[PDB]
Amino acid sequence: KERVIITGANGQLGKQLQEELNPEEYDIYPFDKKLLDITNISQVQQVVQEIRPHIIIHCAAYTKVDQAEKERDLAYVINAIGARNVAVASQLVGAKLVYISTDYVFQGDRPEGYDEFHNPAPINIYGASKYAGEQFVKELHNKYFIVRTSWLYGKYGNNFVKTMIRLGKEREEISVVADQIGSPTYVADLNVMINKLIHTSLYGTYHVSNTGSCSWFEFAKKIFSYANMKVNVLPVSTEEFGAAAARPKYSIFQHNMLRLNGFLQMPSWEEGLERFFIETK
Numbered sequence: 179k180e181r182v183i184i185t186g187a188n189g190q191l192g193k194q195l196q197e198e199l200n201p202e203e204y205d206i207y208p209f210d211k212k213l214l215d216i217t218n219i220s221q222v223q224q225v226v227q228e229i230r231p232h233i234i235i236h237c238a239a240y241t242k243v244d245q246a247e248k249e250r251d252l253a254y255v256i257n258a259i260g261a262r263n264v265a266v267a268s269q270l271v272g273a274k275l276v277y278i279s280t281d282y283v284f285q286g287d288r289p290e291g292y293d294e295f296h297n298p299a300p301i302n303i304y305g306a307s308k309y310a311g312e313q314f315v316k317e318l319h320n321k322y323f324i325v326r327t328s329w330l331y332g333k334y335g336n337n338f339v340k341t342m343i344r345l346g347k348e349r350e351e352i353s354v355v356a357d358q359i360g361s362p363t364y365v366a367d368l369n370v371m372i373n374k375l376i377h378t379s380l381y382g383t384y385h386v387s388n389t390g391s392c393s394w395f396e397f398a399k400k401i402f403s404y405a406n407m408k409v410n411v412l413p414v415s416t417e418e419f420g421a422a423a424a425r426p427k428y429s430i431f432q433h434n435m436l437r438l439n440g441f442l443q444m445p446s447w448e449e450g451l452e453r454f455f456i457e458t459k
């Protein structure tokens with residue numbers, strides 16, 4: 179009857195991960211920002227000592243990509259220092275640590291993607307802050323799973339899929355960026371993989387995302403395809419959209435670690451999106 183702590187339980191993952199972990203196997207201890215402030219080490223240790231968990235799924239993070247450029251110290255304090263504090267505590271209790279990371283740790287300029295062994299080169303403050311976060315984890319703990327994902331969206335909270343369906347009903351046409359390729363990842367599919375990793379000790383860095391490349395534009399079209407909504411999508415560039423943070427033109431991962439560790443391949447983003455509508459009918 180293992181114990182699992184989830185940091186940042188109110189976010190997209192925490193909110194949905196908390197519901198997908200089998201309760202008749204683990205004692206799920208979710209914590210919000212106020213009940214477990216990642217930036218307060220004294221508090222982090224108190225909570226981790228008392229509950230003393232076997233597993234810790236660290237979802238807490240500052241996910242404001244654009245504003246990250248204007249508030250750098252705040253990006254690091256949360257993403258870097260925060261991961262360092264949770265790392266320390268994880269070590270004192272000997273808990274397996276799952277650190278969720280991103281594809282912004284790379285330049286994202288290669289169409290085929292990057293494997294878990296290529297040296298990262300953060301493209302923006304957000305990416306750099308979590309890379310620093312990953313390093314404190316490897317440096318201060320020895321039972322972890324660095325899970326990099328991208329274009330994550332789930333049942334709870336606002337996301338690109340809910341926005342299209344919301345705006346789609348009112349518009350006759352809608353313009354979406356089409357010069358940024360990526361791979362939409364549905365939380366449910368990610369959680370399934372996280373769940374598989376926590377039952378083992380195959381520690382390391384893993385890229386978990388849905389299969390196939392895509393683009394907000396093509397993704398947008400297919401969202402309306404399954405939604406069965408007749409609306410047009412106009413392809414626009416990044417310069418006309420005006421971005422305060424520099425996204426990559428190719429944010430795709432190579433799924434080596436999963437394939438090298440006997441795990442099966444993730445479903446396609448196309449297929450990951452299907453189960454989204456099915457579950458949120």
Ligand SMILES: NC(=O)c1ccc[n+]([C@@H]2O[C@H](COP(=O)([O-])OP(=O)(O)OC[C@H]3O[C@@H](n4cnc5c(N)ncnc54)[C@H](OP(=O)(O)O)[C@@H]3O)[C@@H](O)[C@H]2O)c1
Pocket residue numbers: 185186187188189190191192210211214215216217236237238239240241256278279280281308327328329330331335
């Ligand atoms: N497209 C994506 O979303 C994407 C892509 C790549 C990687 N990731 C990573 O995936 C992970 C999952 O995050 P998400 O997608 O669920 O985004 P999210 O909804 O913003 O989740 C992050 C949560 O952490 C909380 N938090 C902020 N400061 C905290 C603190 N000091 N202590 C504890 N919690 C704090 C936030 O609460 P408040 O909002 O109330 O402050 C928020 O609920 C993140 O670590 C993110 O870096 C996400």
